[PDB]
Design a protein around this ligand. Structure first.
Ligand SMILES: O=c1[nH]c(-c2ccc(N3CCOCC3)cc2)nc2ccccc12
Ligand SMILES: [Zn+2]
Lengths: 47, 161
């Protein structure tokens, strides 16, 4: 893995084209996330 | 040391996690190539991931970040999709879970949109889809996502396409 930009603990990817997109985030240390919920699902075919 | 505890569909905790999952679906610019074509999910199960060691490792780092950022961890709950979710829940996140070619450098990527993380369940770009049918839009095969507690601290803002 790379390092966070100096003086920062993560990167926020702000959408600047797709008006409906929410943000995405990057951490560079695995200790900064804890996998709280495991969700099992299917995608549903649209009607 | 990981145990998985099933949440009942009647539990408020199940319901608030399901709502975050469902309400953050969006359309993707690939028309569904990577993740499939869908507007919603059939949620089959939600399990709480309990591992004392991994929790302590998280809270230890959270405190370090917090103390570097005016007592503010800037903690979020975010989605993560990966072919390695089973390793993650047992061994935690580490460098092997990083997206080397991601747009913001080699690191571990999380999304607010559940449907964005869904694009990575079978690998980068959806890889070759489900193991059974080789279908990125498989409606039969059971998929897994993680809903994670993530410490952002001071986050670098990258404006982007
Ligand atoms: O949930 C995400 N997973 C991933 C993701 C990308 C790559 C991986 N890999 C893990 C290590 O092997 C190579 C593939 C795992 C997860 N990327 C995202 C990018 C943006 C927003 C969300 C995600
Ligand atoms: Zn399938």
């Amino acid at each position: 893995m790379a390092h966070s930009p100096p003086g920062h603990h993560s990167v926020t990817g702000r959408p600047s084209v797709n008006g409906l997109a929410l943000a995405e985030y990057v951490i560079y240390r695995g200790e900064q996330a804890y996998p709280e919920y495991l969700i099992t699902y299917q995608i549903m075919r649209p009607e | 040391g990981t145990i998985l505890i099933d949440l009942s569909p009647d539990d408020k905790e199940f319901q608030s996690v399901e709502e975050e999952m469902q309400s953050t679906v969006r359309e993707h610019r690939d028309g569904g190539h990577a993740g499939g074509i869908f507007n919603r999910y059939n949620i089959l199960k939600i399990q709480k991931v309990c591992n004392k060691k991994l929790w302590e490792r998280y809270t230890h780092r959270r405190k370090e970040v917090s103390e570097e950022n005016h007592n503010h961890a800037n903690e979020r709950m975010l989605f993560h999709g990966s072919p390695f979710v089973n390793a993650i829940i047992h061994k935690g996140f580490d460098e092997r879970h990083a997206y080397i070619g991601g747009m913001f450098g080699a690191g571990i990527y999380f999304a607010e949109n559940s449907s964005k993380s869904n694009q990575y369940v079978y690998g980068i770009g959806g890889g070759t889809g489900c193991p059974v049918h080789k279908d990125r839009s498989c409606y039969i095969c059971h998929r897994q996502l993680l809903f994670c507690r993530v410490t952002l601290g001071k986050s670098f803002l990258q404006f982007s396409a």
